[PDB]
Design a protein around this ligand. Structure first.
Ligand SMILES: NC(=O)c1c(F)cccc1F
Ligand SMILES: NC(=O)c1c(F)cccc1F
Length: 147
């Protein structure tokens, strides 16, 4: 029936069925469509006070809470999905990762190199698809699979 990773869910505010992926935290209205040695991803990282290194090019001392970081991530996802903003533009401006200078691009990678909730979400995304909030010891990520 459903591809692995996906489940049916019910909207609380409309009652309409939707689909949720518990590996990528993606959610969508349509029934999902459905592994390679390597994938290529970009990401937008929002750090918080419990990040492994709570500092970034944006801020010497990152002091926001994980709850505040998630609210920021959720707001960026809204703007990307509505088309008000582009993923690459938000990553260049607001990602707490050094990859901000490359529009969030991390290049290609294999299994065994990234933190593993990042890796699992990356390889579960289809080409062009974007994750929901993904949690690692670095912070909270939005992941875009580009290849
Ligand atoms: N976007 C979110 O914060 C989220 C949620 F509200 C429920 C499940 C998974 C999620 F990533
Ligand atoms: N792909 C990357 O990891 C990267 C880059 F291409 C340029 C600057 C910083 C980075 F982390």
């Amino acid at each position: 029936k459903l591809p692995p990773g996906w489940e049916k869910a019910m909207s609380r505010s409309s009652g309409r069925v939707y689909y949720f992926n518990h590996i990528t935290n993606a959610s969508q209205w349509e029934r999902p469509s459905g592994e390679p040695a390597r994938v290529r991803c970009s990401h937008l990282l929002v750090k918080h006070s419990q990040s492994r290194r709570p500092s970034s090019w944006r801020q010497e001392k990152i002091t926001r809470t994980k709850e505040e970081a998630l609210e920021l991530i959720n707001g960026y996802i809204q703007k990307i999905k509505s088309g008000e903003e582009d993923f690459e533009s938000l990553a260049s401006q607001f990602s707490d990762c050094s990859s901000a200078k490359a529009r969030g691009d991390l290049g290609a990678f294999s299994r065994g190199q990234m933190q593993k909730p990042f890796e699992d979400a990356s390889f579960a995304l289809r080409t062009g698809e974007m994750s929901g909030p993904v949690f690692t010891d670095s912070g909270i990520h939005i992941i875009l699979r580009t290849e």
